[PDB]
């Protein structure tokens, strides 16, 4: 069971919640879904720009589930031979059914399920048959059971025609590169262990958007950790930080290469 958990991240409040009530309450508090008396949701998706903690947020919820779990990539389930995938996908949506309750996690599913075209070829179609047998499993003639999918992706609009609708995925989460106030809680947990006790004044360290995700944080806490160490000093000051921040941000492509829009 991966050690990561809630409170290993605190960058956000809602995106955690908007799926948690799909997946983590019905194993605990289902009275709230039968008194109001509805048919709950089973399956979501979580996309957005990278470096924002998609794959993370699976390994948190998979820590505190009490039900089984499956870790996959869409590329895994295509094989060279003609008609080995479409039966494979019929296996795992069988084994999870019998072993209920259950959770699935496909990641980077744009591997296989992205979009269809006519494809006068012979390999592209065996990718389609898997895409077509999958969307039979998730909802078709016969019902699936209690199987809660979690799919991930970095670019929706360049993919995903009909696998993304209700019946199959009943909601859609948006991750984006953070704002100011989220970052106040991001590095605080990355940096709850370093000494750093001198002079930092974090609260104007990361001022604007600056086009950096939560994962450019982990690097800066790293390089500025040892950049002290190479001076054979352990506890840290601000110079060690800004000496890092200038390095990361340097790599950024000139997003404002235009400057045409005064």
């Amino acid at each position: 069971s991966p050690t990561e958990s809630y409170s290993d991240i605190g960058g956000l409040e809602s995106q955690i919640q908007e799926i948690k009530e799909s997946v983590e309450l019905p194993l605990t508090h289902p009275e709230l879904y039968e008194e109001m008396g509805i048919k709950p949701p089973k399956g979501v998706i979580l996309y957005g720009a990278p470096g924002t903690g998609k794959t993370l947020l699976a390994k948190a919820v998979a820590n505190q589930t009490s039900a089984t779990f499956l870790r996959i990539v869409g590329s895994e389930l295509i094989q060279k031979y003609l008609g080995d995938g479409p039966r494979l996908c019929r296996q795992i949506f069988k084994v999870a059914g019998e072993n209920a309750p259950s959770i699935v996690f496909i990641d980077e599913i744009d591997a296989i399920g992205t979009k269809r075209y006519d494809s006068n070829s012979g390999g592209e179609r065996e990718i389609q048959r898997t895409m077509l047998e999958l969307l039979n499993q998730l909802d078709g003639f016969d019902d699936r059971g209690d199987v809660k999918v979690i799919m991930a992706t970095n670019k929706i609009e360049t993919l995903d025609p009909a696998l993304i609708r209700p019946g199959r995925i009943d909601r859609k989460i948006l991750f984006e590169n953070p704002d100011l106030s989220t970052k106040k809680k991001i590095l605080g947990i990355h940096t709850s262990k370093m000494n750093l006790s001198e002079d930092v004044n974090l609260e104007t360290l990361v001022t604007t958007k600056d086009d950096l995700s939560g994962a450019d944080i982990q690097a800066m806490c790293t390089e500025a950790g040892l950049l002290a160490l190479r001076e054979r000093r352990m506890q840290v000051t601000a110079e060690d930080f800004k000496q890092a921040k200038e390095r990361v941000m340097k790599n950024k492509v000139e997003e404002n290469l235009e400057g045409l829009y005064l």
């Binding site: 991966p2 390994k59 990539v73």
Partner: peptide, 8 residues
Amino acid sequence: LNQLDGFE
């Protein structure tokens, strides 16, 4: 490189 298991 950053799967569940990979990161784990």
